[PDB]
Short mmCIF file of C-alpha atoms in Angstrom, two decimals:
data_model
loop_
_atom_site.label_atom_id
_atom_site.label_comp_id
_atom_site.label_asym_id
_atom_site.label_seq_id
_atom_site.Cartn_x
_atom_site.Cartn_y
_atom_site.Cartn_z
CA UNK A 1262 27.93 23.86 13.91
CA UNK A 1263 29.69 26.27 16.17
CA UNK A 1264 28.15 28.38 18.89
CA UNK A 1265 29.32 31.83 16.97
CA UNK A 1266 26.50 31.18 14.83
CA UNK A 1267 23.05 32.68 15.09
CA UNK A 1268 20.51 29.56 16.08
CA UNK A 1269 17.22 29.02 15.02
CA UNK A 1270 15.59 27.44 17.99
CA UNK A 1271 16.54 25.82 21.50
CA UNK A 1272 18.67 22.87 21.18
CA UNK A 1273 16.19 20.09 22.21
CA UNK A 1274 14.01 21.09 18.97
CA UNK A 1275 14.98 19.01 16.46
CA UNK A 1276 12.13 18.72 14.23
CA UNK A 1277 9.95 21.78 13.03
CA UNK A 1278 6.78 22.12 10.65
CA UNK A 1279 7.17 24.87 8.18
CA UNK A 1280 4.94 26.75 6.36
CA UNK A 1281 1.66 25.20 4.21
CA UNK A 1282 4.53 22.88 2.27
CA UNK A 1283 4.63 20.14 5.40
CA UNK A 1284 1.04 18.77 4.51
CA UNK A 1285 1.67 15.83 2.87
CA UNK A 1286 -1.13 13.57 1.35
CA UNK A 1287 -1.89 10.13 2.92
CA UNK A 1288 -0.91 7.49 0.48
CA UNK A 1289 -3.56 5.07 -1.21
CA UNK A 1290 -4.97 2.57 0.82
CA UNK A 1291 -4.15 4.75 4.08
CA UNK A 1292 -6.86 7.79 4.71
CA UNK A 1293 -7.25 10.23 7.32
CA UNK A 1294 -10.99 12.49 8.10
CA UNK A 1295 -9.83 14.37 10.96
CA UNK A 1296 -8.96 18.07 10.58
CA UNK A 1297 -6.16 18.16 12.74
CA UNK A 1298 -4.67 14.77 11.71
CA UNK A 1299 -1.64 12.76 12.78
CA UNK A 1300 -1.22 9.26 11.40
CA UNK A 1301 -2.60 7.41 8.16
CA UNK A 1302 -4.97 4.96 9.33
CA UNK A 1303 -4.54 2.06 6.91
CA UNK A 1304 -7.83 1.04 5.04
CA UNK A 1305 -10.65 -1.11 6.60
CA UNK A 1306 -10.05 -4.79 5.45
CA UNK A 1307 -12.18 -5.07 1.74
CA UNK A 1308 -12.48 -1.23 1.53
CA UNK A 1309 -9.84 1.38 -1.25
CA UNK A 1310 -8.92 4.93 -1.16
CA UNK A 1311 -7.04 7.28 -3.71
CA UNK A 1312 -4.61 9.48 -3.02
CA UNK A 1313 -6.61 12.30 -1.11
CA UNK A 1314 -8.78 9.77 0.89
CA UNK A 1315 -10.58 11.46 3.65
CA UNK A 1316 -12.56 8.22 3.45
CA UNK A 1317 -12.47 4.81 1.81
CA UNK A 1318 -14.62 2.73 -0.65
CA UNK A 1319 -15.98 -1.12 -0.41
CA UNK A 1320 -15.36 -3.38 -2.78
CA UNK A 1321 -18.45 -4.04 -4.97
CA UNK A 1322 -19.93 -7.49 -5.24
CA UNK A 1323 -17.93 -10.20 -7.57
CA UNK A 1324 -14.92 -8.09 -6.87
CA UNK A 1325 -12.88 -8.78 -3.60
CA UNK A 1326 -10.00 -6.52 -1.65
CA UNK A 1327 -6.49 -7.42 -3.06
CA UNK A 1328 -3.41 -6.36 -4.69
CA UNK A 1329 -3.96 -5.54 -8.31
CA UNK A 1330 -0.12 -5.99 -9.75
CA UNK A 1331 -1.11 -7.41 -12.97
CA UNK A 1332 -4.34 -6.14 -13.85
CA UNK A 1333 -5.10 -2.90 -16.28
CA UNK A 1334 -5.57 0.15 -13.44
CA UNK A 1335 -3.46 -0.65 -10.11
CA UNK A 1336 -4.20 0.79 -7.65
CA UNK A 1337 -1.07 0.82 -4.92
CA UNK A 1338 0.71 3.68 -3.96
CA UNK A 1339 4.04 4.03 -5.79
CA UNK A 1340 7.56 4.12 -3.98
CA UNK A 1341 7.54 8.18 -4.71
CA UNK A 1342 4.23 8.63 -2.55
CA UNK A 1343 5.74 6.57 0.62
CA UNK A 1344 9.32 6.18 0.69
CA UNK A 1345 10.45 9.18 -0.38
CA UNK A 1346 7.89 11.47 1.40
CA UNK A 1347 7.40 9.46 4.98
CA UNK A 1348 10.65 6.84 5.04
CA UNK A 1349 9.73 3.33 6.17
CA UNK A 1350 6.39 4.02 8.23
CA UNK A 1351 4.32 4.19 6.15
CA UNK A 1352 4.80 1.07 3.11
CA UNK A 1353 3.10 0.45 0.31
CA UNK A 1354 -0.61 -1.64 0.84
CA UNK A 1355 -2.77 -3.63 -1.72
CA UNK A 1356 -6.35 -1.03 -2.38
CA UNK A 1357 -7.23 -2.87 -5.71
CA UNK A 1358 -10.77 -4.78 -6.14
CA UNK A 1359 -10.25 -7.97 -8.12
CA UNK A 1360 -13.16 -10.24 -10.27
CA UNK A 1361 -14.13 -13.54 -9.05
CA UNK A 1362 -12.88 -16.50 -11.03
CA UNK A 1363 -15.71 -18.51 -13.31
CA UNK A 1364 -17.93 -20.71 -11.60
CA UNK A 1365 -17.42 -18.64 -8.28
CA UNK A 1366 -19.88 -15.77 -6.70
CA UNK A 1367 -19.25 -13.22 -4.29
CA UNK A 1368 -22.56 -11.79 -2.76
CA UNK A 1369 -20.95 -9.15 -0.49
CA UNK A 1370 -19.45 -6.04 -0.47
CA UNK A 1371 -16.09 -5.23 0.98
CA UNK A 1372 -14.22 -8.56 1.07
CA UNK A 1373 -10.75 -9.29 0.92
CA UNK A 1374 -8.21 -12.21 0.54
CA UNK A 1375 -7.71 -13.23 3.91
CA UNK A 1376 -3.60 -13.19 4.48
CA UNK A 1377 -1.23 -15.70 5.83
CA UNK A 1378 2.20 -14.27 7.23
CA UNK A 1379 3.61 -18.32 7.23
CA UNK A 1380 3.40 -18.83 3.87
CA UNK A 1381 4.97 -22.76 4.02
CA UNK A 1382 2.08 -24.12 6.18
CA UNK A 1383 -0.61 -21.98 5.34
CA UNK A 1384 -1.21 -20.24 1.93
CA UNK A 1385 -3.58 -17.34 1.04
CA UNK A 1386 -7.18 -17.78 0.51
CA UNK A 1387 -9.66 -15.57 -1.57
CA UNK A 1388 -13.39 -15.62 0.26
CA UNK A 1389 -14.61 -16.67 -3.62
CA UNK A 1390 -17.76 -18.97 -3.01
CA UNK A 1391 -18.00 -21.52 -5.24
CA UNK A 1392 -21.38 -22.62 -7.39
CA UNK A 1393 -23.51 -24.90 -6.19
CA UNK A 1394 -24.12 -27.99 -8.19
CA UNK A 1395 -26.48 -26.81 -11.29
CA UNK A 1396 -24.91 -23.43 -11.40
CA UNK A 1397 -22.78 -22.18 -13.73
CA UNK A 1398 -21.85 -18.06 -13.02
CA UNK A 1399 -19.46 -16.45 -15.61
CA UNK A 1400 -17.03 -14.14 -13.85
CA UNK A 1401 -16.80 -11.45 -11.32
CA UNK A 1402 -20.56 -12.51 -10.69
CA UNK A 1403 -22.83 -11.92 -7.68
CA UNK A 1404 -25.02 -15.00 -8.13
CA UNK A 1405 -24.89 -17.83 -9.78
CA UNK A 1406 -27.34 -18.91 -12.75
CA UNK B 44 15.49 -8.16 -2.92
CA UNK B 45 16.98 -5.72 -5.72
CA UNK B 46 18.45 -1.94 -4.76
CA UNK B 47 17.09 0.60 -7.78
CA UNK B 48 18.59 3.99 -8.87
CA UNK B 49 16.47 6.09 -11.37
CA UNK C 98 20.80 -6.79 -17.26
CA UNK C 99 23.96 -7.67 -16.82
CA UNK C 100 25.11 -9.97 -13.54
CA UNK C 101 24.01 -8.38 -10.08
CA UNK C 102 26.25 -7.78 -7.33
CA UNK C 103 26.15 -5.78 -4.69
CA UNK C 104 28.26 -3.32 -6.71
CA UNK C 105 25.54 -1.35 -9.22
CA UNK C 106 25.83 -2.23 -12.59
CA UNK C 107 26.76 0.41 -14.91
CA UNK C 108 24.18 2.68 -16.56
CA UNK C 109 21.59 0.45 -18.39
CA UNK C 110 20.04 3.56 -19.90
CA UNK C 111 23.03 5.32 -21.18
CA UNK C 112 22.06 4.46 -24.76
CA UNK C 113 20.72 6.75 -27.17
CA UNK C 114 17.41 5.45 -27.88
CA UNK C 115 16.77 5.75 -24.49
CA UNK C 116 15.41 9.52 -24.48
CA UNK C 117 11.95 11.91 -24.19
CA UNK C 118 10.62 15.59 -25.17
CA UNK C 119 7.73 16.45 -22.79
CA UNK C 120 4.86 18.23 -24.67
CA UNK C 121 3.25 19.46 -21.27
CA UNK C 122 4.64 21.87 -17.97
CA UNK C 123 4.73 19.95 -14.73
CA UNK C 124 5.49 16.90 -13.00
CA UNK C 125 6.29 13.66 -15.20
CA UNK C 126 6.54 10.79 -13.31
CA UNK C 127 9.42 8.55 -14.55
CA UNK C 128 8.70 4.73 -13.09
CA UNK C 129 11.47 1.78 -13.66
CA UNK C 130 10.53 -1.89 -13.29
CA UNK C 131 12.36 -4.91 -13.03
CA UNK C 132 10.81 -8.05 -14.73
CA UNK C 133 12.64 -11.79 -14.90
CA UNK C 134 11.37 -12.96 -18.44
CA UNK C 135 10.82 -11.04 -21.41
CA UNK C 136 7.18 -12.16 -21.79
CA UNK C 137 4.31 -10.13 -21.11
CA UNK C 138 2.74 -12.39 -17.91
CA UNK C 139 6.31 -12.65 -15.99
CA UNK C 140 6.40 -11.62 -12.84
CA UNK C 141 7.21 -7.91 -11.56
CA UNK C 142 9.89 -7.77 -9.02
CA UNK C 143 10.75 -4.15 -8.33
CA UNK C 144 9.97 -0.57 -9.41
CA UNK C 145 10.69 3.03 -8.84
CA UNK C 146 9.41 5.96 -9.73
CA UNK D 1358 -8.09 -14.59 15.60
CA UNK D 1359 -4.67 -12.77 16.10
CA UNK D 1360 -3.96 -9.86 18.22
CA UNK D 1361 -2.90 -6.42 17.28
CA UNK D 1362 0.94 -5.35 18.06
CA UNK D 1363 1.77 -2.84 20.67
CA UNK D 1364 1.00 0.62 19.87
CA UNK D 1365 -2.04 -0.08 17.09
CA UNK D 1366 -5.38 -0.61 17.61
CA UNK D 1367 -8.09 -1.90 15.68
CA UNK D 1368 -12.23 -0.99 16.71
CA UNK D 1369 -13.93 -2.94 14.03
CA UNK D 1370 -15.15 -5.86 14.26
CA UNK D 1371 -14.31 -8.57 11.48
CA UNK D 1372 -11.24 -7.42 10.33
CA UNK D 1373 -8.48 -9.49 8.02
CA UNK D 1374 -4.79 -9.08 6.46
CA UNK D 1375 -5.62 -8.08 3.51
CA UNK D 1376 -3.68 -10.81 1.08
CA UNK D 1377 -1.22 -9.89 -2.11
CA UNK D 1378 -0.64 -13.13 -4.62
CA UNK D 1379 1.98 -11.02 -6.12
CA UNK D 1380 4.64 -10.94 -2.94
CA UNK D 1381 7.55 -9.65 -5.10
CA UNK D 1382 5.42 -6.48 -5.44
CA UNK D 1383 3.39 -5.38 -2.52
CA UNK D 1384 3.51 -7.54 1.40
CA UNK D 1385 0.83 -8.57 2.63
CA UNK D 1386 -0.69 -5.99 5.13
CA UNK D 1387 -2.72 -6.14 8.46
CA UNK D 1388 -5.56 -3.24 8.92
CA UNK D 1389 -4.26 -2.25 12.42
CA UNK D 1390 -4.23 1.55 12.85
CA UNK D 1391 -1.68 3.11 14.50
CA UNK D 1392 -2.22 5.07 17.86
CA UNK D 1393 -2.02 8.87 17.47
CA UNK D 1394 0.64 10.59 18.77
CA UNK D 1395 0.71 11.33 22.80
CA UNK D 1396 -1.30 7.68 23.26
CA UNK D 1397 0.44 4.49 23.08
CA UNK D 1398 -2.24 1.00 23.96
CA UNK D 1399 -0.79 -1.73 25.22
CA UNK D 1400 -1.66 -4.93 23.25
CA UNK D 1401 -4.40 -6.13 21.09
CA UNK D 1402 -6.27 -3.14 22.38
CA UNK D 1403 -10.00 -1.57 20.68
CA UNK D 1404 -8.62 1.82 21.55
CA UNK D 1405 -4.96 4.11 22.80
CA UNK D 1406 -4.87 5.47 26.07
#
């Protein structure tokens, strides 16, 4: 405040990293490997982390990359784990892996429901492929029967 | 949008 | 709730039902969500934790 | 095919926004890393400089 007061540091440091207390953990969806690490890489499109995450996960087949708001075990970070640790850079991501409708089939792993930022023109679409005709599938399914 | 305090 | 302005409403928890004992040390995490109909499938629009 | 915005980067190939039904929730969100810090990229770039 006044310069009668014993400083801490030069005047153009504004930011310092104390002691063990300034690692914080990547959120989920976001995952870092490197030892010395900097930013949260966000999540490979069709892949989920947890908290931790020094690597991600693919989406098993029937199940494609999306949010999972309504379903039993969601998987997005909370507000506590982004907002109030790193402010607005890093927000919260979709890391949940959903089950194909009925009479759809997903053969591959790591898929996710491709976006669409101009929602009045063009609406989000799920990479579900449908049965052929003569093919049933129940749900969630890899192949159809 | 909707402004929480908890 | 009541009517939303940009003023916050008044407490919404200040009742007396609206209370815990933990059983456990730690960290609890305390989450709040904000639905628009009382049924189960309505859609969540806000939480905090 | 979009590009990535300045300062992010993406080196995989076959990438997509990753879609949320539930937009009240969670925004959708693109899988475009961020550059580290002391490198910066320019535009739509496979790697920071």
């Amino acid at each position: 405040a006044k310069y009668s007061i014993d400083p801490t540091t030069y005047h153009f440091v504004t930011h310092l990293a104390m002691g063990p207390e300034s690692c914080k953990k990547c959120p989920k969806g976001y995952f870092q490997p490197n030892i010395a690490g900097t930013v949260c890489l966000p999540c490979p499109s069709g892949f989920v982390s947890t908290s931790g995450a020094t690597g991600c996960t693919a989406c098993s087949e029937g199940t494609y990359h999306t949010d999972g708001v309504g379903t039993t075990t969601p998987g997005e970070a909370t507000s506590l784990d982004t907002t109030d640790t790193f402010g607005s850079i890093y927000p919260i991501i979709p890391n949940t892996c959903r089950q194909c409708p009925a009479n759809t089939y997903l053969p591959l792993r790591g898929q996710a429901a491709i976006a669409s930022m101009n929602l009045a023109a063009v609406s989000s679409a799920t990479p579900c492929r449908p049965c052929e005709d003569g093919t049933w599938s129940k749900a969630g399914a890899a192949g159809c029967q | 949008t909707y402004t929480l305090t908890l | 709730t009541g009517a939303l302005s940009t003023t916050p409403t008044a407490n919404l928890v200040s009742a007396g039902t609206y209370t815990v004992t933990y059983a456990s040390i730690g960290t609890k995490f305390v989450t709040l969500r904000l639905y628009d109909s009382a049924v189960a499938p309505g859609v969540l629009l806000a939480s905090k934790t």
